[PDB]
Amino acid sequence: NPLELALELKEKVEKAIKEILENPNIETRILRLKELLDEVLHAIALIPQNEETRPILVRVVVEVMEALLHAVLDGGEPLLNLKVLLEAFKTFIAALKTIGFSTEEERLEAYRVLTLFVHTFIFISRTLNLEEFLKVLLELIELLEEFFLAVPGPPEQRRVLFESLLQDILNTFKKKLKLYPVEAQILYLEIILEKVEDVRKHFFEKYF
């Protein structure tokens, strides 16, 4: 019966998270959390999927991702943390795709997780230099587009959240750029604005 499998997977994930959080090494915590996320994805892949189990899997994946975000916020080199965050976010999108969403509560949970991820990524990536900043920001924008193409729902919130998150990214980029001479402003502002306009156009063509 699928429901019992969902409960046993939930308990297994809870014990695994409790074990991993106990470890003193922060980098070890991050790596084991990423591996746990991948194993959770493979576990959902095997479990039968239906109405009742779907919210259970959604919640368990949300707990894993939130725990990983909190752990990656504690310590570590910023670049390694950002790369692990990107890989984990790709796995998160894949898990959300295979699970599928029906109820509104799961949609709101995923949207909250996305907002938390965006804020955490911006906060961590604040400390880098210019080139890595631009690279990670472009990767974040692309993954944002992929996630908004992954979760189906009403288009109004789909538009509002995308606009708000792109505005957050632009504000952070401008804030960072104001620390550099006038010449770099032109180049990097042009690059970021063109990328944002392109992704906005792609999304607006999609939802129509």
Binding residue (CB under 8 A) for a copy of itself from 50, 157, 204, 206: 157
Report, in Å, the least distance between residue 63 CB and a copy of itself: 18
Of 8-16, 34-42, 99-107, 170-178, which segment contacts Zn ion by CB under 5 A? 34-42
21 binds, among a copy of itself, Zn ion, none (CB under 5 to 8 A by kind): none
Which long-range contacts does 26-31 make (Cβ < 8 Å, 24+ apart)? 26/71, 26/74, 26/75, 26/76, 27/76, 27/80, 29/71, 30/68, 30/71, 30/72, 30/76, 30/81, 30/84, 31/84
Of 14-22, 50-58, 59-67, 162-170, which segment contacts a copy of itself by CB under 8 A? 162-170
Of the CA atoms within 13 Å of residue 48, those in its CB half-sphere come to 8
Asked whether the beta carbons of 114 and 161 are under 8 A apart, the reply is yes
Report, in Å, the least distance between residue 149 CB and a copy of itself: 9
Interacting positions 110-149 with a copy of itself (CB under 8 A): 111-112, 115, 123, 126-127, 129, 131, 134, 138-139, 142, 146
Binding stretches for Zn ion (CB under 5 A): 38, 74, 168, 198
